[PDB]
Design an enzyme around this catalytic site. Structure first.
Site, PDB file in Angstrom:
ATOM      1  CD  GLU C  13      -1.628   2.426   1.220  1.00 10.89           C
ATOM      2  OE1 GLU C  13      -2.150   3.318   0.455  1.00 10.89           O
ATOM      3  OE2 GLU C  13      -0.733   2.653   2.063  1.00 10.89           O
ATOM      4  CB  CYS C  60      -4.928   2.872   5.310  1.00 11.59           C
ATOM      5  SG  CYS C  60      -4.275   1.520   4.306  1.00 11.59           S
ATOM      6  CB  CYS C  63      -5.265  -1.519   7.378  1.00 11.47           C
ATOM      7  SG  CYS C  63      -4.564   0.129   7.539  1.00 11.47           S
ATOM      8  CG  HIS C  67      -6.474   4.199  10.496  1.00 10.41           C
ATOM      9  ND1 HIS C  67      -5.416   4.539  11.358  1.00 10.41           N
ATOM     10  CD2 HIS C  67      -5.931   3.551   9.441  1.00 10.41           C
ATOM     11  CE1 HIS C  67      -4.299   4.125  10.820  1.00 10.41           C
ATOM     12  NE2 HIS C  67      -4.575   3.549   9.632  1.00 10.41           N
ATOM     13  NE  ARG C 478      -0.418  -3.604   5.805  1.00 13.38           N
ATOM     14  CZ  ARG C 478      -1.631  -4.110   5.525  1.00 13.38           C
ATOM     15  NH1 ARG C 478      -2.615  -4.017   6.416  1.00 13.38           N
ATOM     16  NH2 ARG C 478      -1.840  -4.772   4.409  1.00 13.38           N
ATOM     17  CB  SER C 501       3.448   0.895   8.218  1.00 11.16           C
ATOM     18  OG  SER C 501       2.969  -0.356   7.776  1.00 11.16           O
ATOM     19  CB  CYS C 545       0.160   0.042   5.056  1.00  9.25           C
ATOM     20  SG  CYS C 545      -1.278   0.969   4.468  1.00  9.25           S
ATOM     21  CB  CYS C 548      -0.785   2.805   7.582  1.00  2.00           C
ATOM     22  SG  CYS C 548      -2.466   2.151   7.602  1.00  2.00           S
TER      23      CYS C 548
HETATM   24  N1  NFU Z   1      -2.742  -2.895   9.264  1.00  2.00           N
HETATM   25  C1  NFU Z   1      -2.620  -1.788   8.962  1.00  2.00           C
HETATM   26 FE1  NFU Z   1      -2.556   0.055   8.521  1.00  2.00          FE
HETATM   27 NI1  NFU Z   1      -2.941   0.544   5.952  1.00  2.00          NI
HETATM   28  C2  NFU Z   1      -0.646   0.030   8.842  1.00  2.00           C
HETATM   29  N2  NFU Z   1       0.477   0.090   8.999  1.00  2.00           N
HETATM   30  C3  NFU Z   1      -3.074   0.457  10.305  1.00  2.00           C
HETATM   31  O1  NFU Z   1      -3.292   0.651  11.370  1.00  2.00           O
END
Ligand code: NFU
Ligand code: NFU
Ligand code: SF4
Ligand code: SF4
Ligand code: SF4
Ligand code: SF4
Ligand code: F3S
Ligand code: F3S
Ligand SMILES: [Mg+2]
Ligand SMILES: [Mg+2]
Lengths: 551, 268, 551, 268
Positions: C13, C60, C63, C67, C478, C501, C545, C548
């Protein structure tokens, strides 16, 4: 000498009793009896012609769509309506997708447990079962692991002590001839068939508004609003959704259903030599593709003396030759008027007298074509298409026969198609050819909408005075259907349905000739007169629908 | 563990109510019969026929006395002492009263069983009636429609199985989760109705914009059900009004099979 | 010292740049750079606290859910709200089902083509590919005929000359070590994965209102109206539909994903001996099951010195030891304030100076826990659960190791988990244990509704005056996610997200210590610096990600 | 048989617009990329990385000049000369202007690409704009939503491929099949709205009977879309209002990410 009754016949639509005289352990004489009547023909009388289709669709929910389309075709014939071609594309997609569902469910849910022993499937080696289909089918769900998961579901069912729909079947019966491995294969395909028939009905639902019992027809065309740019109507997103489901049907039909038809034939070769129902066969042409209620994708016609040289083609739903031959008699049925009646002049006056071997014994009328008894349905439609030298039907039949030859070393000649298994083969051939009908008609609809034609409906002009006579023909899953409508002073003055199971399940006619079911049983070997599996096998080959036969 | 027993008897049925199960996804008919219930009697699906299937029913009526759900589709014909529907040489009304004696719960599936439906329309040739009329001393759960969405039936059975009692019923003994509201009081074309945006002919400009079908004879205003919300076949956006045909009122006694397709909801 | 850049890094991502110095065919030093910033923490500022979750969910879309849940947990923390237990069951089913989709797509669509050569699959024998999974998997779609259908799809793509997505991948690269048969198995599983992840997201959609980006949350619980008897709300029919899709996930996760993880390890054993990111690991406990925001199904904690005996359990999202430790530094990021900042006092003032090897090189902040660099994600959550003696996690890891042992004769010690393949194994174990979370939480919801509890929402009291600080912890696919909300005079005065991330992709911190990505690349062998597959393999194991990481 | 080329560039994207393709069923993403189109460039799915994937982009822009559909997701940041989104060492705005020159058709998928969306909300830290603002005097097809139903995109591409032209567009260049009507002018809760039957608080009596969400801040009166009819994920009955939560107006500029969840919409 010995007299048996099978009441109820299960794994059909509706209420059927079959009686047989047995001599020397072979059926010598039979009676077919429809034991339930509703009077759908009387319920629909005195209504606006436009209303008929929503009422007479409820003749049957297994062959849903068929009475609805035949009813609007009858009103259209009575009022000289040319159906918009886009309405023909949509009617044809619904009929082909419905028929796919119908045939798959017939072979697996209604018929397979006549031929397949679920207690023998528990004894099978899943690896050996998988090994048998190597080079026979390219189907992706014939693994040992798939067959193990299936065998475990049957094991768990039997172990529960609650066999439910599988309780007290013909398990260990002498006429069960599949080895354990082929039984397990057939049960795996039984469960996989249910996924394929669901996809077929998603096609029907997206054009019909639901199924069972579609709700998108009209005398004059369809209620689908075509508009590629419209929200909440039949736009390009909805058509792509329909196509996604059309595309899921072909693999199962070609790699499973078609192959299983040949496998069952391979283990039951004497069923290619018994269960002939008639020497005369009728089918109507189907799937009109012009704006004049004609140019059928599938031909129809009449065959006599079981001799394909006698083929008389029928290429119009307006053919006077077809229209003038059809009569029904209640000489051996529970209605008052016993002489043969043309359906525009038909009556349906109940006269229940109870059972009499020599008198009246069914709610089913006995149809005739120019005085003769006729079999209708997929064998009739197959023989007509073969006699017409339709390449696609010859090629499809030869594919099934090539699998049988690969399994047995033997071949199947046209003479052996006049049989219980030949009737089953006709149905599988029909289901296979319908997959090209779905692709052809979807594409034709996409092409036509592209040229700017969004017409789906023509308003019928119903004269407030005068008499109009109409007939709607349709090649239903079980054979030629006809709805006969008389309009007098803007309302239905007479309504008669002559339904495929009426032709096949009909009792003795005005000249005491037995119907196809009754003829097919003569010579049936009976290993156990209290469990006449051999009788149910031949009767199931006709795909009986008794709500259809009697209405 | 053991699965709850179900006994299914078809009277003057077209088999559409059974066929509804083949469209179901939660559960699928194969998960229904292998996992959620024991379908002890069903003439359309049973391996057994004739004498062996009648054995299965009498064995189930005895073994599961007081425990089975009894399901009936089709109307019951009372004219001429029941002879318009005879199974194994006896009027279906006799099969039904026998089975109803030992039932833990009784379901009329479809408009025919719920109130007589199409089989009891017009002159009613067979004196067809609904199941409640045949079984006047019993509480019948009605699941009308021709046929209903199969989940209207399956979520009723699931409620009985999971929570040990029927779901909440309205005054006509219909489950409120499926029949508690007029189609018109939860119809996505209500804004068109309100604005006077009406289709007047199939294929016309209003029709091809998804306008209200009141003036084509929509019975939504007098029909209780969940056709506009639950809809059909679990593909999304499939019910008669969505595909461009008025509701016929198939759920509702006195509307479906009595009023004309194009007869407006306010005309008697 | 040769210098390479990988920009863009694909099959992640968002927007990642990796730079490596290569000495003697081995990377000696690395930089991770997030190259895109939106300022999501600024966008949400000065709003009603109830609005944040719908805005910051858009950090994101891969994921999605995470959030949103973390935001409402942060507002609920600030406002001392106890979430109704039915709202916990619903949030948990959504998070577990989403994480199932997320992990399956990561292993197949994002990672597999680092380890799998599709051109080599073309040379496979399908029968031998099918035969080598005998006794290894009970999966029903491993037949020669399935692998042949897949091989023909690959053949037709190559023959079109339009490889598109698959064009100029690392086909023939010397680090590609699978035999043709195991490449073809992996491609077949890649395509099957797409059906499984779609079923996972149908669970999410039926409770969230859609996915991506659910729309069923609230500060105070959820917007789902529970009423078994209600038309148009969350009734028994809707719950049965949810269960039908939950039931479809387990077989693919257990019989395909879990087995493919052991199979890839078996052919890539040195990747158990490189790619260590950190010696310190953090995970939050997850899936609360009481009325007080606690009683988590999954434990969390802190491990230091790569030594599981140091395991410090974290059993509460209110744990002051966890809350007080977390800081972020922009010393080497494109922001103004460089000293480590507690997120409640955090700032995000952009300061773009372009790329400097010794200065600022990323939009990602560098998080620390009591000044230490920490790895988060499924390796972290697996080490914490092993250290907590969770028998479920031990049993699941041992099942993967048993398949590896059967295929190679070797075993996997806990020391070998601190690696690129250990991180992949931890994600697979996570996905497998989540299938029991889905069954447990669905059953808990059905049982609770049965006891008469239909409560889904507590109305927040947001005082018009005063300052309130809240933190929302969530164990995301993640790793540990935290949202930090300050409320002043009824509106958001500060909002900071510290995203998993961010921990893993963070640049050099205030004491110049490299982040996990940057450390993990030290010692990576490079066979061809123009085609640095080995770097991309190690970085993909963390499931980067960057939307993120940066927000 | 050659498949029509598509180049997909992500600017300030959350990847939700790409993820929407993984929920699609007609076509599925695997049938999209293997049968319907040739996806010549996509950072999320590409086997190739770094120099090699930027090679694929350059190869495709040349070979398919005048033929490819350019798809952009995410907002384009213009503040500080484009440095808030840098791919292969250049501002994404430059990659986009280069790809736009050879495009047969250009699609902005999602609210970010269509009008700036969440990335351009509040103080707009990066000076995020929509695609039409960076490509003045090019025809941009806008498929808004955060993310849109993937079939709003797929049926747009299908129209271009099958009929050789774009679908009919409204004044904001949105396809009329998906964005031609207000959600409130085709919403099944309109009867509740008309009668004054409103949910006031999640979990209240009205909420639990599926009444209108207007007074919880439903933006359906101010938002063009097909969320009430096409809905989401093709399982049937799944959109935010059916689930119990007001429309947030994510499709509509000035509504989504500007108005509070519980702020009331203007009704026409
Ligand atoms: N899993 C995940 Fe995200 Ni696109 C990350 N790093 C969020 O909390
Ligand atoms: N196929 C079929 Fe029906 Ni239930 C019969 N027979 C009607 O047309
Ligand atoms: S209710 Fe309708 S579908 Fe069911 S039996 Fe009666 S006619 Fe058939
Ligand atoms: S279509 Fe029918 S139910 Fe819907 S608003 Fe119009 S009259 Fe009412
Ligand atoms: S439109 Fe929504 S889903 Fe698409 S990139 Fe923007 S924030 Fe993500
Ligand atoms: S305000 Fe929202 S929920 Fe109410 S009728 Fe309008 S779109 Fe539907
Ligand atoms: S005709 Fe029947 S199926 Fe529903 S839409 Fe009307 S009640
Ligand atoms: S929030 Fe967006 S997804 Fe549809 S329901 Fe409203 S426009
Ligand atoms: Mg008749
Ligand atoms: Mg942050």
């Amino acid at each position: 000498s010995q007299r048996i009754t099978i009441d109820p016949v299960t794994r059909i639509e509706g209420h059927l009793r079959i009686d047989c005289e047995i001599e020397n352990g072979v059926v010598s004489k039979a009676w077919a009896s429809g034991t339930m009547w509703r009077g759908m023909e009387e319920i629909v009388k005195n209504r606006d012609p436009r209303d008929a289709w929503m009422i007479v669709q409820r003749i049957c929910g297994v062959c849903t769509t068929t009475h609805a389309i035949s009813s609007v075709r009858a009103a259209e014939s009575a009022l000289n309506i040319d159906v918009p071609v886009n309405a023909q594309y949509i009617r044809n997609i619904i009929l082909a997708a419905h028929t796919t569902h119908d045939h798959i469910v017939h072979f697996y849910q209604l018929s397979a447990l006549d031929w397949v022993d679920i207690t023998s499937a528990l004894k099978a080696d899943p690896a050996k079962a998988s090994a048998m289909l190597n080079g026979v089918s390219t189907w992706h769900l014939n693994s040992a692991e798939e067959f193990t998961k299936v065998q475990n579901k049957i094991k768990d069912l039997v172990a529960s002590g609650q066999l439910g729909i599988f309780a007290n079947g013909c398990w260990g019966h002498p006429a069960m001839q599949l080895p354990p491995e082929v039984n397990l294969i057939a049960v795996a395909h039984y469960l996989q068939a249910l996924e394929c028939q669901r996809d077929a009905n998603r096609v029907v639902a997206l054009l019909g508004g639901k199924t069972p019992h579609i709700q998108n027809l009209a005398v004059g065309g369809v209620a689908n609003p075509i508009n590629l740019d419209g929200l909440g109507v039949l736009n390009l997103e909805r058509l792509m959704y329909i196509k996604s489901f059309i595309d899921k049907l072909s693999d199962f039909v070609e790699q499973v259903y078609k192959v299983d038809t040949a496998v069952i034939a391979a283990f039951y070769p004497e069923w290619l030599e018994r269960g002939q129902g008639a020497v005369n066969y009728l089918s109507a042409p189907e799937f009109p593709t012009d704006g004049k209620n004609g140019s059928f994708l599938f031909p129809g016609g009449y065959i006599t003396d079981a001799d394909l040289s006698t083929y008389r083609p029928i290429t119009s739903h307006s053919d006077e030759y077809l229209i003038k031959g059809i009569q029904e008699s209640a000489k051996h049925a529970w209605y008052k008027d016993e002489a043969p009646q043309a359906p525009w002049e038909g009556t349906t006056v109940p006269d229940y007298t109870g059972w009499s071997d020599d008198g009246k014994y069914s709610w089913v009328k006995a149809p005739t074509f120019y005085g003769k008894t006729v079999e209708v349905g997929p064998l009739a439609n197959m023989l007509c298409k073969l006699a017409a030298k339709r390449e696609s039907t010859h090629a499809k039949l030869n594919e099934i026969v090539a699998i049988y030859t690969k399994l047995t070393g033997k071949t199947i000649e046209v003479a052996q198609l006049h049989s219980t298994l030949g009737r089953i083969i006709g149905r599988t051939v029909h289901c296979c050819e319908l997959q090209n009908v779905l692709q052809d008609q979807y594409n034709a609809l996409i092409v036509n909408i592209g040229k700017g034609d969004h017409t789906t409906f023509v308003k019928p002009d119903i004269p407030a005075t005068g008499e109009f006579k109409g007939v709607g023909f349709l090649e239903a899953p079980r054979g030629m259907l006809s709805h006969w409508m008389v309009i007098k002073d803007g309302i239905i003055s007479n309504y008669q349905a002559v339904v495929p199971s009426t032709w096949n399940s009909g009792p003795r006619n005005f000249n005491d000739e037995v119907g196809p079911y009754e003829r097919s049983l003569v010579g049936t070997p009976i290993a156990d007169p209290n469990k006449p599996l051999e009788v149910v096998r031949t009767i199931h080959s006709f795909d009986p629908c008794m709500s259809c036969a009697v209405h | 563990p053991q699965r709850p027993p179900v006994i299914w008897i078809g009277a003057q049925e077209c088999t559409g109510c059974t066929e509804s199960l083949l469209r179901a996804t939660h559960p699928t008919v194969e998960n229904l019969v292998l996992e959620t219930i024991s379908l002890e009697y069903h003439e359309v699906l049973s391996a057994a026929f004739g004498h062996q299937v009648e054995e299965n029913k009498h064995n189930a009526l005895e073994k599961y006395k007081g425990q089975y759900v009894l399901v009936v589709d089709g109307s019951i014909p009372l004219k001429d002492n029941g002879i318009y529907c005879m199974v194994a040489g006896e009027p279906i009304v006799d099969h039904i009263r026998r089975a109803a004696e030992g039932a833990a719960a009784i379901i009329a599936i479809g408009s025919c069983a719920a109130w007589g439906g199409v089989a009891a329309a017009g002159v009613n040739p067979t004196g067809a009636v609904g199941l409640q009329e045949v079984l006047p001393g019993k509480t019948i759960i009605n699941i009308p429609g021709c046929p209903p969405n199969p989940h209207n039936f399956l979520a009723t059975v699931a409620h009985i199985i999971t929570y040990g009692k029927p779901p909440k019923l309205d005054a006509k003994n219909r489950p409120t989760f499926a029949y508690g509201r007029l189609i018109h009081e939860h119809c996505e074309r209500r804004p068109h109705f309100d604005a006077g945006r009406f289709a007047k002919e199939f294929g016309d400009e209003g029709h091809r914009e998804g306008w209200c079908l009141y003036h084509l004879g929509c019975k939504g205003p007098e029909t209780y059900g969940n056709c506009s919300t639950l809809q059909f076949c679990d593909v999304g956006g499939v019910w008669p009004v969505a595909i461009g045909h008025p509701c016929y009122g198939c759920n509702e006694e006195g509307i479906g099979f009595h009023k004309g397709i194009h007869q407006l909801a306010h005309v008697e």
